[model samples]
Target: GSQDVTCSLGYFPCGNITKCIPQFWRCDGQVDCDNGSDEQGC
Candidate 1:
């Protein structure tokens, strides 16, 4: 498959090819985007 992933209304993209974690899983010192897309700016 090609790299064209889009998160849903309540989800956020992990900036990766896949693995879009939930918005609720962001911040809180947890890793949503792995490298720090969700944990960024905190």
Candidate 2:
């Protein structure tokens, strides 16, 4: 339990700076990534 986490295909990274949350999480009216990349397109 000391390794880095990874996201599978068909998934988007949190700007590649963070974990891979649900794509729906992107611009879901909330902030996920530290850079707010999820809300960038919204």
Candidate 3:
């Protein structure tokens, strides 16, 4: 099933399993997720 997961606090859902850790100060919407799967947590 597809889980509706959102990025941590300041961090946005960049990908699955990996959130934009540390939360950047100024992010202009970019591919922060390395594997494009940082939004979904393990």
Give Cα-based local distance difference scores for all models.
Answer: 0.68, 0.72, 0.49
* Candidate with maximal TM-score: 1
Candidate 2 lDDT, 1-42, residue by residue in tens: 796868866666776576677776766877767667787878
lDDT of 3 at 34: 70
Q: Which ten contiguous residues of candidate 2 have the minimum total lDDT?
A: 10-19
| TM-score attained by model 3 | 0.26
Candidate 3 global Cα RMSD? 8.0
- Report lDDT (Cα) of residue 8, candidate 3: 66
The lDDT leader among the candidates is: 2
Question: Please, what are the lDDT tens digits per residue for candidate 3 over residues 1-42?
Answer: 887655566664444454555466224344456754433342
Using TM-score, rank the candidates from best to worst: 1, 2, 3
Candidate 3, after superposition: displacement of residue 15 in Å? Answer: 4.6
Residues 1-42, candidate 1: write the lDDT tens digits: 685676788876665546677868876676646567666775
Where model 1 places Cα greater than 4 Å from the true spot, the runs are 1-3
The collision pairs in model 3 are 15-37, 15-38, 15-39, 16-37, 16-38, 16-39, 16-40, 17-40, 18-38
* Candidate 1: residue pairs that collide: none
